[PDB]
Amino acid sequence: VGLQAALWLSADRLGDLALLLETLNGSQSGASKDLLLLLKTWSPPAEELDAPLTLQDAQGLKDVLLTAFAYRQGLQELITGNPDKALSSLHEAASGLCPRPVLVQVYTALGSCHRKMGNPQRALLYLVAALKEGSAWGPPLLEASRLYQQLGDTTAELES
Amino acid sequence: CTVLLQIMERESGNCPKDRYVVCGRVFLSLEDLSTGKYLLTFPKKKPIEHMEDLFALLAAFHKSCFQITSPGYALNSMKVWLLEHMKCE
């Protein structure tokens, strides 16, 4: 199911994904059209006792699902212009498995959220954090250039 | 037994202030312990509600401190290991 849902999340079939996981849990959870509630509600059934080996296991997949889905929900809501729904899902990225390149991108994403809300000093927090933890400091310096443009700090913008 | 708390300052190299105090006296017997009353006997005394009994287990036990660094992840799995795998109150 984990693997099926990984295919449908790479190929943008989020309605059928929901339907599958609704069927998996009690279908009483039918109105819960949020995925990021169903994916948490979805319980892998065993500790995976002495069976054949595996390169991965139900939880080790579910924990990648929650973070990838929440990250994607966040970026869609940002570009679509709801940087009020974004912050919930972009903190749900960091509260669970988050390889550090996933966290750098979550932080640039929150810099964007706050700049669009009109809180440039909070955006600066998350972009400094992304600079520190990242070996990839393109997307933060770009967010900074856009921030100094928004304020007027043109010398700082051109330096960024 | 009687109980003697001794205190020595470290900053003053005169050894000036070697105060003490007698903090009291413990009576103990077999007629006490035969009626429980001071023991910790596990699982019956699960619900920990006299904090002396917590402080006794944080005394008696072999303590060991570990640093955990996850250097290419974030580390949140702990609370789950604690609450779900280890089934912590």
| Residue given tokens 């202030």 in the structure block | B17
Q: What is the resolution of this structure in A?
A: 4.2
Q: How far is CA A57 from CA A1, A27, A78, in A?
A: 11, 24, 32
Q: How far is CA A97 from CA A7, A59, A77, A111, A114, in A?
A: 19, 11, 21, 21, 24
Contacts of residue B72 in chain A, CB cutoff 8 Å?
A: 99-100
Cβ proximity of A143 and A125 under 8 Å: no
Residue B39 and residue B32: Cα distance in Å, rounded?
A: 9
For an interface test with A, give the residue of B70, B73, B75 to mutate (most A CBs within 10 A).
B73
For an interface test with A, give the residue of B69, B70, B75, B77 to mutate (most A CBs within 10 A).
B77
Strands B2-6 and B20-25: antiparallel
What was the elucidation method? cryo-EM
Cβ proximity of A78 and A86 under 8 Å: yes
- Determine whether the interchain pair B73/A98 forms a contact, defined as Cβ–Cβ distance below 8 Å: yes
Residue in chain A nearest B76 by alpha carbon: A96
Q: What is the nearest CA distance from B80 to chain A, expressed in angstroms? A: 10
Question: Where would I find the H helices in chain A?
Answer: 2-10, 14-24, 35-41, 58-79, 86-94, 101-117, 120-133, 139-151, 154-159
